[PDB]
Design a binder for this molecule. Structure first.
Ligand SMILES: COC(=O)CNC(=O)C1CCCCC1
Length: 435
């Protein structure tokens, strides 16, 4: 695998030992061959688990999730997928890694897609080798892969709202369930219904993931209500998965706004990863997988692929050349390579709006491409009346940095800035000039 000019897809079934058994062997061989190596983790929780499996080995952990005293002579770097892409975007010099290992290489967040594109372009050019570790590579059509012990698969109606009757099977279970919901708001409704019924529920989402995941280990629970984030290597001691089989899809309408379409079916890779949370212990057969819908290829036209093209267009590769998307996922967006390439100052604003501003890639691009500087927030209030953001059935209001009370009405509308209460609270703070 380690031979230059080669991209290998390590596609062992979920729980086959790609992280705790295969990755340390690859690391030992890379160190023996003096290959400058990067290890890419999807999240900080996976980076902490990687330290446990790589313990003893000389690895430089470029994350504050690990507390290790580095020796200074490590030739292997470990960081999150988003850290890798962020460092490529910034003026900082990133080593031209000879070996690029991406764990959970199925992650469809814009920075993961961008990192796959940059890495695969370097391999195609003959400059490096790469290993993509995932049971579900782009284009998988099997929602029921192999497992460590047999799983009982059952197609069943799954509640997406609170219920009073008709789903006795959900609460009459005495084990631990991981339930995948299409959104934070839908998860709040179901978590509330389960709590009123006497259950102990933990809720997981992108913003709360590292903090709340620790609760699955620190306390006894009955249910874990989660969004699609738990498809990226999150491990639980569960005996059942309840899967709505639904997700939200960000869509760019008329090139002028982003909506959260759906809930709509998940891909075969997502359904296989959700199911993959159980059937992992060979000494415990009979783990249950209850699914409430079918699969579809809902990544075609999904905004994350257009956003990944916006990131790659602004990453230097070689003179005027631009990284292509990883070939099995390149058709998911209709995009001209180089069309989002920004001049130096606009690119600096684009990066800052995503890093400090915490804005979605598409939204950051509209603002920076319009020649607006990072601290200029006049665009958060000068949009059309149909762009009025609503809070508790009434228009959302903020005090501007000038001391004026104004209705939040952004020039460009991205439904992700107000998809839940935490999201709207952060966008109000941004519109106020608080970061
Ligand atoms: C779910 O989508 C996101 O989180 C998009 N955000 C990113 O990828 C940024 C990470 C840090 C700077 C570069 C881009």
């Amino acid at each position: 695998m380690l031979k230059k000019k080669q991209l290998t897809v390590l596609d062992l079934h979920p729980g086959a030992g790609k992280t705790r058994r295969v990755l340390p062997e690859i690391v030992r061989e890379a160190i023996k061959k003096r290959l400058r190596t990067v290890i890419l983790a999807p999240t900080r929780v996976v980076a902490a688990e990687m330290e446990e499996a790589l313990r003893g080995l000389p690895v430089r952990y470029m994350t504050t999730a690990v507390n290790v005293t580095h020796s200074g002579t490590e030739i292997v770097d470990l960081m999150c997928h988003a850290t890798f892409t962020s460092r490529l975007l910034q003026p900082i010099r990133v080593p031209n890694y000879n070996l690029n290992i991406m764990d959970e290489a199925h992650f469809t967040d814009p920075s993961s897609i961008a990192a796959r594109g940059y890495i695969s372009t370097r391999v195609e050019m003959g400059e490096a080798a790469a290993i993509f570790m995932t049971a579900t590579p782009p284009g998988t059509r099997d929602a029921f892969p192999d497992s460590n012990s047999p799983i009982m698969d059952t197609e069943v109606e799954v509640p997406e709202r609170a219920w009073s009757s008709g789903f006795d099977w959900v609460t009459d279970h005495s084990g631990k369930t991981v339930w995948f919901v299409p959104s934070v708001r839908n998860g709040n409704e179901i978590a509330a219904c389960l709590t009123k019924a006497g259950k102990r529920v933990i809720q997981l989402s992108r913003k709360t993931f590292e903090t709340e995941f620790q609760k699955t280990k620190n306390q006894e629970w009955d249910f874990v209500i989660t969004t699609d984030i738990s498809e990226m290597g999150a491990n639980f001691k569960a005996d059942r998965v309840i899967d709505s089989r639904r997700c939200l899809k960000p869509v760019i309408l008329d090139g002028e706004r982003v909506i959260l379409a759906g809930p709509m079916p998940v891909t075969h890779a997502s359904a296989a990863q959700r199911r993959g949370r159980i059937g992992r212990n060979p000494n415990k057969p009979g783990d249950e997988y209850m699914y409430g819908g079918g699969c579809a290829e809902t990544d075609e036209g999904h905004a994350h692929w257009l956003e990944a093209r916006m990131l790659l267009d602004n990453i230097y590769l070689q003179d005027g050349l631009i990284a292509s998307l990883y070939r099995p996922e390149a058709d998911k967006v209709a995009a001209i390579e180089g069309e989002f390439k920004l001049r130096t100052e606009q690119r600096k604003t684009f990066v800052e709006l995503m890093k400090r501003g915490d804005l979605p890639v598409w939204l950051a691009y509209q603002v920076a491409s319009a020649g607006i500087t990072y601290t200029d927030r006049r665009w958060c209030f000068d949009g059309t009346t149909n762009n009025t953001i609503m809070e508790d059935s009434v228009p959302a209001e903020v005090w501007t940095k000038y001391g004026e009370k104004r209705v939040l009405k952004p020039r460009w509308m991205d439904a992700r800035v107000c998809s839940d209460h935490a999201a709207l609270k952060s966008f109000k703070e941004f519109a106020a000039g608080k970061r």
